[PDB]
């Protein structure tokens, strides 16, 4: 390939050398050649170089070539380069600038991957903001639980589609002892297992307990509520109120 | 004779009794071979664990010098020992087995007694380095193969005839099996046509079981001795050890530990189908 390039430059179609250097993934040599033959390809090739630098873990040069691969015409290429710059700056520890470019990029996928990157740096708040920006309420609730900021967890719960986070937040409330947000979370967690337990223990509403049994086929607390509430002469009707 | 042959810690022993330390490349009823100690075997199965001896008494296991530790079975006479990593599986022919931890000074029962019959005779048992995966039900061997999930406490049975895995190659029956000495998720199986073919699989918890490699047994080889990175080691038909580099592992035999681990990840993600992750693993190579 060295001799092939040396012969190509002396030919009447010099750009062919660039092509083979581009075809050989020799992006450094391709950038060296493109300064003479095809400068319009200077951005694209540079971006590709950074991509390889990104995949080789050499983020420092990846940032430089991403910011050096910006154009003024190809909107998609510019957006991809900006997303790369954002990811690199985030991985540079320049978290303020990185999240700044993260905010100003119209692509939810960038927020999706940037949340994982922040989880790699374990900055729970930034990951939560990034996830909640585009569409990811569940991941935002997960990282908020990691940060134990249950206010935002409860804010996201109406949009949270993950019952596991509902279960975790309900356990947190059980630790807090409110036993009412816990009930709603357990119901959203498909966890009437704990809803009937709370109605047996905390709210002490046998009528709502048996209504839960009738409307959801609650089993674990089905006999237990009757056992606790069978302390009356006519409470047999209660032990039959659970359909035995 | 049966020619009881074993392989462990890059040491291959065949009863003749050829011993090959392939790490150093030095060649000299049952035999068990490690780097330092080789033990020949009143026990159905016995082995060395450094200087420990796994004597198998009636419904009992003991360790003594060249009496140190005792373990009681409540479960048939144990007759299947396999030490890999820091975990030993002790199994019987009565559909029961246990896994004992060896990361500490003495063997402690990592898993309680379990009933294979309740979940599903036993041909043989083998264990991984991590010990979280624990087998062929049966006195001819059966096509189905059972693996006991210790952590999530279940069993997975793969049928050779149907190619289906039940959670609780169609004309081949397993007769021997082994494990890789470094990756707990890499398993191997020798299947004889009811000729002989070697099937390597990867056990991924989040995906299930994967078909990693499927190759006919080499002509010079007659039994599956096992593997150790990066070679499948077999007992050669009369150096009586035949080492075949793995199909993906052609060319990186002399690489360092990091590179071989990365391309191990490559092969595992190829079995998964995770092209991107295998690509990332190869990236540095």
Curated annotation (Swiss-Prot), chain A:
Instruction: Supply the name of the protein.
Output: WD repeat-containing protein 19
Swiss-Prot/TrEMBL TPR repeat ranges: 4-37, 43-76, 108-141, 163-196, 219-244
Q: How does it assemble?
A: Component of the IFT complex A (IFT-A) complex. IFT-A complex is divided into a core subcomplex composed of IFT122:IFT140:WDR19 which is associated with TULP3 and a peripheral subcomplex composed of IFT43:WDR35:TTC21B. Interacts (via C-terminal region) with IFT122 (via C-terminal region). Interacts with BBS1. Interacts with TTC25.
Tissue specificity here reads: Some isoforms are tissue-specific. Highly expressed in the prostate. Lower expression in the cerebellum, pituitary gland, fetal lung, and pancreas. In normal prostate, expressed in both basal and luminal epithelial cells. No expression detected in fibromuscular stromal cells, endothelial cells, or infiltrating lymphocytes. Uniformed expression in prostate adenocarcinoma cells.
What does this protein's UniProt record list under function? As component of the IFT complex A (IFT-A), a complex required for retrograde ciliary transport and entry into cilia of G protein-coupled receptors (GPCRs), it is involved in cilia function and/or assembly. Essential for functional IFT-A assembly and ciliary entry of GPCRs. Associates with the BBSome complex to mediate ciliary transport.
**What is the annotated localization of this protein?**
Cell projection, Cilium; Cytoplasm, Cytoskeleton, Cilium basal body; Cell projection, Cilium, Photoreceptor outer segment; Cell projection, Cilium, Flagellum
Locate the transmembrane regions by residue number: none
Which illness does the annotation name? Cranioectodermal dysplasia 4: A disorder primarily characterized by craniofacial, skeletal and ectodermal abnormalities. Clinical features include craniosynostosis, narrow rib cage, short limbs, brachydactyly, hypoplastic and widely spaced teeth, sparse hair, skin laxity and abnormal nails. Nephronophthisis leading to progressive renal failure, hepatic fibrosis, heart defects, and retinitis pigmentosa have also been described. Short-rib thoracic dysplasia 5 with or without polydactyly: A form of short-rib thoracic dysplasia, a group of autosomal recessive ciliopathies that are characterized by a constricted thoracic cage, short ribs, shortened tubular bones, and a 'trident' appearance of the acetabular roof. Polydactyly is variably present. Non-skeletal involvement can include cleft lip/palate as well as anomalies of major organs such as the brain, eye, heart, kidneys, liver, pancreas, intestines, and genitalia.
Which Cys pairs does UniProt list as disulfide-bonded?
none
Q: What is the covered span of the full protein?
A: 733 to 976 of 1342
Could you tell me what induces this protein?
By androgenic hormones. Expression increased 3-fold in an androgen-stimulated androgen-sensitive prostate adenocarcinoma cell line compared with androgen-deprived cells.
Swiss-Prot record, chain B:
Location in or out of the cell: Cytoplasm, Cytoskeleton, Cilium basal body; Cytoplasm, Cytoskeleton, Microtubule organizing center, Centrosome; Cell projection, Cilium
Which consequence is recorded for altering residue 264 to R?
No effect on localization to the basal body
The record's TPR repeats, renumbered to this chain, cover: 259-285
Q: What exactly does this protein do?
A: Component of the IFT complex A (IFT-A), a complex required for retrograde ciliary transport and entry into cilia of G protein-coupled receptors (GPCRs). Plays a pivotal role in proper development and function of ciliated cells through its role in ciliogenesis and/or cilium maintenance. Required for the development and maintenance of the outer segments of rod and cone photoreceptor cells. Plays a role in maintenance and the delivery of opsin to the outer segment of photoreceptor cells.
UniProt disease link: Short-rib thoracic dysplasia 9 with or without polydactyly: A form of short-rib thoracic dysplasia, a group of autosomal recessive ciliopathies that are characterized by a constricted thoracic cage, short ribs, shortened tubular bones, and a 'trident' appearance of the acetabular roof. Polydactyly is variably present. Non-skeletal involvement can include cleft lip/palate as well as anomalies of major organs such as the brain, eye, heart, kidneys, liver, pancreas, intestines, and genitalia. Retinitis pigmentosa 80: A retinal dystrophy belonging to the group of pigmentary retinopathies. Retinitis pigmentosa is characterized by retinal pigment deposits visible on fundus examination and primary loss of rod photoreceptor cells followed by secondary loss of cone photoreceptors. Patients typically have night vision blindness and loss of midperipheral visual field. As their condition progresses, they lose their far peripheral visual field and eventually central vision as well. RP80 inheritance is autosomal recessive.
Quaternary organization: Component of the IFT complex A (IFT-A). IFT-A complex is divided into a core subcomplex composed of IFT122:IFT140:WDR19 which is associated with TULP3 and a peripheral subcomplex composed of IFT43:WDR35:TTC21B. Interacts (via C-terminal region) with IFT122 (via C-terminal region). Interacts with TTC25. Interacts with TTC21A.
Q: What's the protein here called? A: Intraflagellar transport protein 140 homolog
Q: Which organism is it from?
A: Homo sapiens (Human)
Q: Which residues of the full protein are shown?
A: 407 to 798 of 1462
